[PDB]
């Protein structure tokens, strides 16, 4: 059936969105703190990222706050993607066939 969705991820950072107009890093801490030791909080346009000292501390504050009425707004928490970026490239191709001529 369409029960829902389940899985397993090794992410410590929690992606919280749908923040109110009175929500700040300080509020995101104390809230996502009581659960477990926090590392840092990054606020954005409307959403923000909650950094947890441990991957566990998050899982808790995640399934605990996930969809909680924060400041009168139901915020959504989803395991954010890990910071993995790079520019890989390697090739070898060069040739020039001028081949002059006259009339």
Swiss-Prot record:
<feature type="modified residue" description="N6-acetyllysine">
    <location>
        <position position="37"/>
    </location>
</feature>
<feature type="modified residue" description="Phosphotyrosine">
    <location>
        <position position="47"/>
    </location>
</feature>
<feature type="domain" description="RRM 3">
    <location>
        <begin position="12"/>
        <end position="82"/>
    </location>
</feature>
<comment type="subunit">
    <text>Isoform 1 is a component of the APOB mRNA editosome complex and interacts with APOBEC1 and A1CF (APOBEC1 complementation factor). Part of a complex associated with the FOS mCRD domain and consisting of PABPC1, PAIP1, CSDE1/UNR, HNRPD and SYNCRIP. Isoform 3 interacts with HNRPR. Interacts with POLR2A hyperphosphorylated C-terminal domain. Isoform 1, isoform 2 and isoform 3 interact with SMN. Isoform 3 interacts through its C-terminal domain with SYT7, SYT8 and SYT9. The non-phosphorylated and phosphorylated forms are colocalized with PAIP1 in polysomes. Interacts with HABP4.</text>
</comment>
<comment type="subunit">
    <text>(Microbial infection) Interacts with minute virus of mice (MVM) NS1 protein.</text>
</comment>
<comment type="function">
    <text>Heterogenous nuclear ribonucleoprotein (hnRNP) implicated in mRNA processing mechanisms. Component of the CRD-mediated complex that promotes MYC mRNA stability. Isoform 1, isoform 2 and isoform 3 are associated in vitro with pre-mRNA, splicing intermediates and mature mRNA protein complexes. Isoform 1 binds to apoB mRNA AU-rich sequences. Isoform 1 is part of the APOB mRNA editosome complex and may modulate the postranscriptional C to U RNA-editing of the APOB mRNA through either by binding to A1CF (APOBEC1 complementation factor), to APOBEC1 or to RNA itself.</text>
</comment>
<protein>
    <recommendedName>
        <fullName>Heterogeneous nuclear ribonucleoprotein Q</fullName>
    </recommendedName>
</protein>
């Amino acid at each position: 059936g369409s029960s829902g969705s389940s899985g397993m991820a090794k992410v410590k950072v929690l992606f919280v969105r749908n923040l109110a107009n009175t929500v700040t890093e300080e509020i995101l801490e104390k809230a996502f703190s009581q659960f477990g030791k926090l590392e840092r909080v990054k606020k954005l346009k409307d959403y923000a990222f909650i950094h947890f000292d441990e991957r566990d501390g998050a899982v808790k504050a995640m399934e605990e706050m996930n969809g909680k009425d924060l400041e009168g707004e139901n915020i959504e928490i989803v395991f954010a993607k890990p910071p993995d970026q790079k520019r890989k490239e390697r090739k070898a191709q060069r040739q020039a066939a001028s081949g002059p001529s006259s009339g």
